[PDB]
Amino acid sequence: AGVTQSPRYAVLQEGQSVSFWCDPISGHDTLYWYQQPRDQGPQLLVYFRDEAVIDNSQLPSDRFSAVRPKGTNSTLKIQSAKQGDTATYLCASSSGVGTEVFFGKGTRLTVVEDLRNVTPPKVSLFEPSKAEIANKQKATLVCLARGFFPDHVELSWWVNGKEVHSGVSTDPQAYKESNYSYSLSSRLRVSATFWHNPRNHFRCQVQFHGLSEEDKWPEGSPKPVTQNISAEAWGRAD
Amino acid sequence: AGVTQSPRYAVLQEGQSVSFWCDPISGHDTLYWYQQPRDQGPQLLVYFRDEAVIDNSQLPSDRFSAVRPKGTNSTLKIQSAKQGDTATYLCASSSGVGTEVFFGKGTRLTVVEDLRNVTPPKVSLFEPSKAEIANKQKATLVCLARGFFPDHVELSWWVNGKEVHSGVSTDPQAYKESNYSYSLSSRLRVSATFWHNPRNHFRCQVQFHGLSEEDKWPEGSPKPVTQNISAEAWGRAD
């Protein structure tokens, strides 16, 4: 799409390390890494030209390194993560200083006290009311996700196997039901006639970014890896 | 997107009925329904202006009806399905005769001898070779789906929870391993560096269009409803 970063999400326990990986516009000269804490503004970590750090004193501490050994791909590493490192890491690229910057989508990082706390959502779909259908000739489905941790979920809607965007409304932020428990919801509005066709299939899908295969799971419970949890319903003949 | 049809896929047993539903461009005058058998061309079933059938003698038999009672949405019904009805049903819309036609995506219909035969795929992901990675600096994943019936599957690739299209190559047609058994495969090519990051997540997703909730399942086995079957893998540090 332009600047591309991997991964999109990462969850670590205090003390671990993560390497963020960025890949500037196929043709580009300057590359910036930024750290942006949740409710705060972006802080420049470091920037390169071709393959050389231009300004280094930017790096907030010695837990951070960045390299761009051949002048294209860059990797920003954090060792010894602190909860303090929790933030979105933004890559950007540019042609020359001051010439309109171009920004990545970011890599979201959460560092927790204990990976044992990571847990996927339980997802529930609530059906439209008869009163809406008849009075508004529209039908609104409600998706509820809760019990997850951390806040690394993306919710989408699927109608007959094809994603839909128009008619959707999703809470912007997950809600903190507790210490290690979030909650989030979304609405899909469709037409009366559409809901009334029992060959019509509706699915709410929650993508959860959890543990990687490389994370060791001290076991017992099912390991809370990245996974899709869905709830669905079929249209009803009234 | 323009002309919209529901559902996208349907599987019936001989003797049942299906109603296809179409919704022309929000502003449109003429509406056509076509039947297009797999290896053949489109045959006009019927067309309307506003809310009236213009030409009816088109309908191939009395098992078919179409209505457009208020002049917008149309519904084409088949009773007493035959295997002979297996085909893609195409909706199209137009302003006036001969003025460049605009076509829907279609509704794919398969009528079988027995719904008991409907069965979802088993899906397998095969990892890249070390030789490709080192020699080509690229890594190609292989997705295999088989054992499904009927031919109502869509395969997609997901990398860190985001769909990807560039680098994909999917067989155009499922392969007929047997009477009631299809097979299909796909390749995703990514860069060496990308595969080598163990925070990178790769998923092959097969969407299967099966039975609806309204279809009665004579039971025993898990009912082969519409469902997503996935196989995934995480990047490996070499």
CATH number at residue B70: 2.60.40.10
Termini Cα distance of chain A: 44
Q: Are A37 and A78 contained in the same domain?
A: yes
Least Cα separation, residue B215 to chain A (angstroms): 10
How big is chain B, counted in residues? 238
Q: Are B65 and B15 contained in the same domain?
A: yes
Give, in order, the Cα–Cα distances in Å from A8 to each of A214, B149, B200, B235: 17, 35, 9, 14
CB-closest option in A6, A162, A234 to B199 = A6
| Alpha-carbon A217 to chain mean position | 22
Cα dihedral A129→A130→A136→A137 (10° resolution) = 110
8 Å CB contact between B87 and B35: yes
Give B-chain residues touching A212 at CB under 8 angstroms: 198-199, 201, 234
**In this complex, do B201 and A237 lie within 8 Å of one another by their Cβ atoms?**
no
Rounded CA separation A99/A36 (Å): 21
Q: Are B124 and B237 contained in the same domain?
A: yes
Least Cα separation, residue A202 to chain B (angstroms): 10
Tokens encoding B35: 């039947």
CB-closest option in B161, B193, B209 to A8 = B161
Task: Please tell me what resolution, in angstroms, this structure has.
Answer: 2.0
**In this complex, do B201 and A212 lie within 8 Å of one another by their Cβ atoms?**
yes
Choosing from A113, A146, A179, the residue where a domain stops is A113
Q: Are A119 and A175 contained in the same domain?
A: yes
Contacts of A15 (CB under 8 A, 6+ apart): A80, A81
**In this complex, do A18 and B198 lie within 8 Å of one another by their Cβ atoms?**
no
Contacts of A40 (CB under 8 A, 6+ apart): none
Tracing tokens 């899908």 back to the chain, one arrives at A205
Rounded CA separation A156/A230 (Å): 9
**SS3 for chain A, per residue?**
CCCEEECCEEEEECCCCEEEEEECCCCCCEEEEEEECCCCCCEEEEEEECCEEEECCCCCCCCEEEECCCCCCEEEEECCCCHHHCEEEEEEEECCCCCCCEECCCEEEEEECCHHHCECCEEEEECCCHHHHHHHCEEEEEEEEEEEECCCEEEEEEECCEEECCCEEECCCCEEEECCEEEEEEEEEEEHHHHCCCCCEEEEEEEECCECCCCCCCCCCCCCECEEEEEEEECCCC
Least Cα separation, residue A48 to chain B (angstroms): 20
User: What share of residues in chain B are helix, strand, coil (percent, to 5)?
Assistant: 5, 50, 40
Least Cα separation, residue B74 to chain A (angstroms): 11
> Among positive and negative, which fits the CA dihedral B48, B49, B52, B58?
negative
Q: Are B96 and B118 contained in the same domain?
A: no
When divided into structural domains, chain B yields a total of 2
Rounded CA separation B215/A57 (Å): 67
CB-closest option in A6, A161, A207 to B207 = A161
> Among positive and negative, which fits the CA dihedral B234, B185, A228, A166?
positive
Give, in order, the Cα–Cα distances in Å from A119 to each of A136, A204, B106, B234: 39, 19, 40, 19
| Alpha-carbon A238 to chain mean position | 38
Q: Are A18 and A121 contained in the same domain?
A: no
Give, in order, the Cα–Cα distances in Å from A60 to each of A35, A42, A46, A169, B127: 10, 13, 10, 38, 39
Contacts of B166 (CB under 8 A, 6+ apart): none
Least Cα separation, residue B10 to chain A (angstroms): 7
Q: Are B99 and B183 contained in the same domain?
A: no
Task: Please state, as a whole number, how many other Cβ atoms lie within 10 Å of the Cβ of residue A5.
Answer: 21
Tokens encoding A200: 């019509």
Q: Are B91 and B127 contained in the same domain?
A: no
Q: Are A91 and A174 contained in the same domain?
A: no
DSSP state of B83: G
8 Å CB contact between B45 and B64: yes
Nearest Cα residue in chain B from A11: B199
8 Å CB contact between A180 and A119: yes
Tracing tokens 């002979």 back to the chain, one arrives at B84
Choosing from B113, B143, B162, the residue where a domain stops is B113
Name the H helices within B150-221: 192-195
> Among positive and negative, which fits the CA dihedral B47, B48, B52, B54?
negative
DSSP state of B40: S
- Residue among A59, A91, A80 nearest A12 (CA): A80
> Concatenated DSSP letters for B102-134?
EE---EEEEEES-GGG-B--EEEEEPPPHHHHH
- Residue among B80, B122, B198 nearest A212 (CA): B198
Q: Are B65 and B146 contained in the same domain?
A: no
Q: Are A72 and A157 contained in the same domain?
A: no
Tokens encoding B84: 């002979």
Tokens encoding B206: 């097969």
Q: Are B151 and B218 contained in the same domain?
A: yes
- Residue among B221, B205, B216, B84 nearest B153 (CA): B205
Q: Which domain holds residue A88?
A: 2-113
**SS3 (DSSP) at B27:** coil
Peptide bond before residue B198 is cis, with ω within 30 degrees of 0: no
Tokens encoding B118: 């409907």
**In this complex, do A6 and B161 lie within 8 Å of one another by their Cβ atoms?**
no
Q: Which residues of B touch A (CB under 8 A)?
A: 6-10, 18-19, 21, 73, 154, 160-162, 193-194, 197-201, 207, 209, 212-214, 226, 228, 230, 232-234, 237
- Residue among B8, B98, B82, B89 nearest B46 (CA): B89
Give A-chain residues touching B199 at CB under 8 angstroms: 6-7, 10, 18-19, 212
Q: Nearest 5°: phi and psi at B20?
A: -90, 145
Greatest Cα-to-Cα distance within chain A, rounded to the nearest angstrom: 67
Rounded CA separation B5/A190 (Å): 14
Nearest Cα residue in chain A from B8: A160
Q: Using only C-alpha atoms, what is the Rg of chain B?
A: 21
E strand or H helix at B175: strand B175-178
Give, in order, the Cα–Cα distances in Å from B158 to each of A99, A228, B143, B203, B230: 34, 11, 12, 5, 10
Nearest Cα residue in chain B from A4: B194
Choosing from B113, B143, B176, the residue where a domain stops is B113
Least Cα separation, residue A28 to chain B (angstroms): 19
Nearest Cα residue in chain A from B109: A199
- Residue among A74, A2, A81 nearest A34 (CA): A74
Indicate the residue type of B149: F
- Residue among A141, A137, A123, A132 nearest A200 (CA): A141
How big is chain A, counted in residues? 238
Tokens encoding B132: 């490709």
